[PDB]
Amino acid sequence: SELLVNTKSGKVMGTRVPVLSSHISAFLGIPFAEPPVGNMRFRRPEPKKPWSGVWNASTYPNNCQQYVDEQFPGFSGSEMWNPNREMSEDCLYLNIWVPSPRPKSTTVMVWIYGGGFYSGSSTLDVYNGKYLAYTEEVVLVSLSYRVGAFGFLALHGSQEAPGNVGLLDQRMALQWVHDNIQFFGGDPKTVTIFGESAGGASVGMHILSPGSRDLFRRAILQSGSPNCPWASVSVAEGRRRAVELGRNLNCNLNSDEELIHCLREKKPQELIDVEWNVLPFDSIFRFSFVPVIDGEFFPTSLESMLNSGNFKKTQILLGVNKDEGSFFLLYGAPGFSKDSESKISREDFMSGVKLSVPHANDLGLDAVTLQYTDWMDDNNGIKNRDGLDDIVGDHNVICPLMHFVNKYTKFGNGTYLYFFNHRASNLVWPEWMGVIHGYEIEFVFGLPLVKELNYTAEEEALSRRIMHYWATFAKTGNPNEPHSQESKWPLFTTKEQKFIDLNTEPMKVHQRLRVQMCVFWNQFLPKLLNAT
Amino acid sequence: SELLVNTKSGKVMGTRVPVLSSHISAFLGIPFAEPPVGNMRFRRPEPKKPWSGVWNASTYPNNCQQYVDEQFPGFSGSEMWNPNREMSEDCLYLNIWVPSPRPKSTTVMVWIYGGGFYSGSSTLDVYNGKYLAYTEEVVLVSLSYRVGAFGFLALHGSQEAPGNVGLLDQRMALQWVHDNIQFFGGDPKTVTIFGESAGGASVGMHILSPGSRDLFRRAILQSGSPNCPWASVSVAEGRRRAVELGRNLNCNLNSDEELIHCLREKKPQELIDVEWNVLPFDSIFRFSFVPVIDGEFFPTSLESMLNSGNFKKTQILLGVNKDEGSFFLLYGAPGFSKDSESKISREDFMSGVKLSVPHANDLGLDAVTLQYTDWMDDNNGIKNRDGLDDIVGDHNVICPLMHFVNKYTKFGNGTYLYFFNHRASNLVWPEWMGVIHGYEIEFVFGLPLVKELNYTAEEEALSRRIMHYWATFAKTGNPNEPHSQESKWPLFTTKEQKFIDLNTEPMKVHQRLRVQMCVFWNQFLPKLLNAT
């Protein structure tokens, strides 16, 4: 049978699913590790022990335990990201969409979801891989990984909760794809990992980590970079938050053993309930449990690894959306609301910058404020709002990614950069939020090809080009069709720094993506904060 | 006789001079102090002892001893500022142009020349007061004052060379105008002092100095402000340069008395020859001997005097020219020359910023550089050149003046601000220098009304409006004709901050003159340099 695949962990049975008036196979909920429950909670994952019989892979698996957004009950804009399956610590599974008839050896794409390292699911409707597997003829995999304290509690030195275990979950799923994807018609020497936000940062972390470099061929990073200020913490800061988490649950705190023991007896929801109480600052865009710079997964600081070329050398395709600050300002800064235009007062403007650059002293907060204020119109509410969106997005996503691409390109084998700014025709979030985080995922996964979703024809066309760029790049290291007639996405070089806009209009090539602001965030502000 | 005036210091005899096909009287070279020669060198000036007979006031007096520009022999652009009379320490005289027939009691205007406190003359062709006395029916006075070491050598504590004596020379001439201008038909209760560059800064210093406030009614400041970073030094820095000047002339240095004694035996040219060797930094736009913040002429720091309203409350009219950096960059920064377009390399751009902000540490030099560099085109030679012009002009003239006007306006009785940007039709300096320092003096003094000078008709028209604005303001505290039909120059208020452009086109009103850059120079850079 075409839905029966024999793998090294055992036999797996899929299900035929319909797609755009045709059908493909889907193997959902394949386990790739032992359930990390009980005394295994916080521990490195272990490989799934082979099984006898046939694993029923016809339905989505549980989603990892995580914070659930309840800010807008009923609003599809936020609910679409929440877990859509029961939550469970038993959640280490992966999903595979396979073209039909079964390929013999084709390009494999492995999706890594975002969610700030504190949430995320591989089973969301926006991540359904059938449209892309089907259209681009690729075997599409989406993996899963522990988030929150479950995936990132870090007591460096201890082997019981060493940190980075969520990164090891991703790695294990990639090891499983490397070892078994051939049986699904996938080419293991051509796997491209790709992900967005924390997923984009994770992709970059596997590029840096010696232990992960050999499990894939190429990478795509969307609105996420490994050096993002919210993506990692030192071992000391991780230890500090683990202890603080412990203090919030009345734990015995005088040994890592007592602390861990205590945390392991607590129900998932008890950890999730106080997880935000451990942040060191009153901040925005900062998450409690994230990767730690431990000397193992990451041998040295990310910046020195980047400077010395200590990373996998291959091709990468990456980019950002125009409005990377909107979402977090809405959720956490004063003056913003979902149902108003959110014009921001000078007073809220400054409270916002304070929330956005937590680690800044006053001279630093003054530098950011000077840098983004138009002093001829300092009380313009729209300018203040838009200014904050740029500050949050530049500082947290755009400038860290521009720093990463410029550093990577000096040693890599090819870089392609994009700036996605298509203005949705079907606004679900208010208009002031602009081209919000994740809106491009809809095109990468080809949702515009389904009529019942109401996208414009030009959006369907945009979706097909994006999907073909991603897939062609995954197959070859180049998003462009060899000798095609379409406009050529240029390679980004350390000298000319070209990138393209990604929207419904004729491709336009630009240079030095947001250099003016990024020289401020990557060069000036840091030197200033270090002097003072 | 109309050319014979009897004053409190004695009888004075003038000369009839022709002007625009008519004639007025001129009393040139009237002495207002004892010659500050010999043991009087460096000392406070003393009042001129009355004389018997008739003082021949028919020819210009000597010019004070000073550095002579020889950078461009023959070039009229530079030669026009050099002394045009014998130089002599015996130089404390004033000139008066009086309408004919003699007024009974009219508006008096007193001109104070610029020259960085190290040079300047009241006898230059650009300062000939006949066109303005004649056209606006004002009694026009130009005074003179000691410059360089002769006027500003400062050994605070000593009564032999206390500092600020050049400022006391100006004051004495104003005391003489206050006491005698009635005999020339001048109204002593309506004297407006006005000056440019160091002359503009001096005007502001008389506004601050309790000892000078009662000698005049109103003030006009052009490209000069009392708080300009080059306009004053602390008593310690003045003492330091006096000692260093002494060391350059082999003086006995162990007592102010020995030092002064030594400096007094030296010929004028010996002091002028080493005067530039005492600057503390490799700088641009810094002069050796300038006013000192001594606790007398200035009771406390200029900034605290400005904050507390410790200054004369009256009306003021002031402004800048578009290109206040050109002249000093030409003379002192690498990459600039008079006969090339002076496109500036990135390398010279940074050497220039270094020369322009002498007192800056590296984080500071980085802040200026970030602030004026367009990172999408960092190697554009024209942008780099123009960027330097803005840095020099903003830092040295525009931003200090904007700080002064905003502070003054909080307590003053009326402020009028201008931004002069007329593009000369008769370029004498290269075009890249733009609307250079002092080009507006030509219009204030009405040179465009004389045909042999070749100005365009619209320039003659501009000259007549400027002269009438200055004169009407001097007469009334308002540059505008009561109920006129011409566009109204608006009052500058702390709230709306309006100013006008001054050029050959229809008056255009703007707001917040260069706020963006001046918030950087007046607020951010200083806080940064103080932290670090």
Ligand SMILES: *[C@@H]1O[C@H](CO)[C@@H](O[C@@H]2O[C@H](CO)[C@@H](O)[C@H](O)[C@H]2NC(C)=O)[C@H](O)[C@H]1NC(C)=O
């Ligand atoms: C990616 O790597 C390949 C191979 O390592 C590079 O191709 C080589 O290019 C150099 C110079 O053009 C030639 O001397 C070799 O003959 C090429 N080798 C092969 C197998 O083609 C290629 O230039 C790299 N691309 C980028 C963007 O760095």
Ligand SMILES: *[C@@H]1O[C@H](CO)[C@@H](O[C@@H]2O[C@H](CO)[C@@H](O)[C@H](O)[C@H]2NC(C)=O)[C@H](O)[C@H]1NC(C)=O
């Ligand atoms: C300059 O000062 C004059 C007088 O000190 C101000 O005129 C006074 O204005 C207030 C409010 O309009 C009145 O109560 C007085 O009756 C006025 N006095 C006179 C003599 O007119 C004038 O407002 C000031 N102008 C500016 C620009 O500050």
Ligand SMILES: *[C@](O)(c1cccc(CSCc2c(C)nc3cccc(F)c3c2N)c1)C(F)(F)F
């Ligand atoms: C990233 O992983 C990230 C980026 C943007 C939002 C979040 C919040 S958590 C789940 C989620 C995601 C991944 N994307 C969204 C896009 C738009 C609106 C949303 F509500 C939404 C949501 N919830 C996480 C990082 F956090 F690293 F920025």
Ligand SMILES: *[C@](O)(c1cccc(CSCc2c(C)nc3cccc(F)c3c2N)c1)C(F)(F)F
């Ligand atoms: C000011 O007093 C000043 C401003 C500009 C130049 C100088 C140099 S000294 C004599 C002089 C003056 C007053 N103005 C000029 C304008 C244009 C070209 C010139 F060559 C020139 C000259 N020499 C002094 C201060 F120094 F304070 F900036």
Ligand SMILES: *[C@@H]1O[C@H](CO)[C@@H](O)[C@H](O)[C@H]1NC(C)=O
């Ligand atoms: C797999 O599970 C689904 C739903 O739980 C069920 O309908 C289907 O029949 C199962 N297949 C087998 C053979 O277990």
Ligand SMILES: *[C@@H]1O[C@H](CO)[C@@H](O)[C@H](O)[C@H]1NC(C)=O
């Ligand atoms: C004044 O001086 C000028 C030139 O030195 C001379 O021509 C003129 O006659 C003098 N007048 C008197 C009366 O001294």
